């Protein structure tokens, strides 16, 4: 995997490393799941989410 294609499969941020290595990262207020790609909020009001819509679908 490489960050240029399909964002390296990352939900949020992608870093290439020497070899066939890739690491995904998440913005502040999120943590990376064990899939190594998905980011989940760790705070009540993470950036870039709409609380009234996130509550409508929970």
């Amino acid at each position: 995997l490489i960050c240029v294609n399909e964002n390296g499969g990352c939900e949020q941020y992608c870093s290439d490393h020497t070899g066939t290595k890739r690491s995904c990262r998440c913005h502040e207020g999120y943590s990376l799941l064990a899939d190594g790609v998905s980011c989940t909020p760790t705070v009540e009001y993470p950036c870039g989410k709409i609380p009234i819509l996130e509550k409508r679908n929970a």
Partner: protein, 250 residues
């Protein structure tokens, strides 16, 4: 905003209203609890830098519902490359005097990493632009916050399709060329927000255009990806006395 719709209250929770002596100045975008991104050109004629207020949680300018939060603007930071009276480098970073409190109606938009923004977000076709600007060219501004989905153009295509400032590498075009739907005067400084895999990100600032909803012309946005490192460094810096700060760019 021309040809858009009312943003349902709380659905644009990052939108900022900037006031100068209580009068509408411009929009902005909250990117964390003390930091707002707006357009440099909004600040060319400020006489009293100490009467600039940012309002979060605003929706209907006619009423007070209790979700609004007002803050004094403590610092307006503009890139050294911006020249008043011109269009390029049209970005400002505003530090609030006290943090806003995040609530269902007050949430920051994510400031993406540069690589992510350039390689991924730049190819998401449609993004949202919002504001209390004019509803029509030469028309009244909006009392309720408005929002519009607009598609982004590659610059070569914007230039080919358009028919005067250049579109520089610090800008991009978005919108429609049929006169139907656009950003407008008064929306300046507001967000162009891009959705990717469940999260929204800041990709542009409403900046300029030839008229509004002008046939053969598109809205022009500040290309925020050029400024990510500049913004991030400033947000790590201590404040300096005096509201206006010109900071080197790059």
């Amino acid at each position: 905003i021309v040809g858009g719709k009312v943003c349902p209250k709380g659905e644009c929770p990052w939108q900022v209203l900037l006031l100068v002596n209580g009068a509408q100045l411009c929009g902005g975008t909250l990117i964390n609890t003390i930091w707002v991104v707006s357009a440099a050109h909004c600040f060319d004629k400020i006489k009293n830098w100490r009467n600039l207020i940012a309002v979060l949680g605003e929706h209907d300018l006619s009423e007070h519902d209790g979700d609004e939060q007002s803050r004094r603007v403590a610092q307006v930071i503009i890139p050294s490359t911006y020249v008043p009276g011109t269009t390029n480098h049209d970005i400002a970073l505003l530090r609030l005097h006290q943090p806003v409190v995040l609530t269902d109606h007050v949430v920051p938009l994510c400031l993406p990493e540069r690589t992510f923004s350039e390689r991924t977000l730049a190819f998401v076709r449609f993004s949202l632009v919002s504001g209390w600007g004019q509803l029509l060219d030469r028309g009244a501004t909006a009392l309720e916050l408005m929002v519009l989905n607009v598609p982004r153009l590659m610059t070569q295509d914007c230039l080919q399709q358009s028919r005067s400032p250049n579109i520089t590498e610090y800008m991009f075009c978005a919108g429609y060329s049929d006169g139907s739907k656009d950003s407008c005067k008064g929306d300046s400084g507001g967000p162009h927000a891009t959705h990717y895999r469940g999260t929204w990100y800041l990709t542009g600032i409403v900046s300029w255009g030839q008229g509004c909803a002008t046939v053969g012309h598109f809205g022009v946005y500040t290309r925020v990806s050029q400024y990510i490192e500049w913004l991030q460094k400033l947000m790590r810096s201590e404040p300096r006395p005096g509201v206006l700060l010109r900071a080197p760019f790059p």
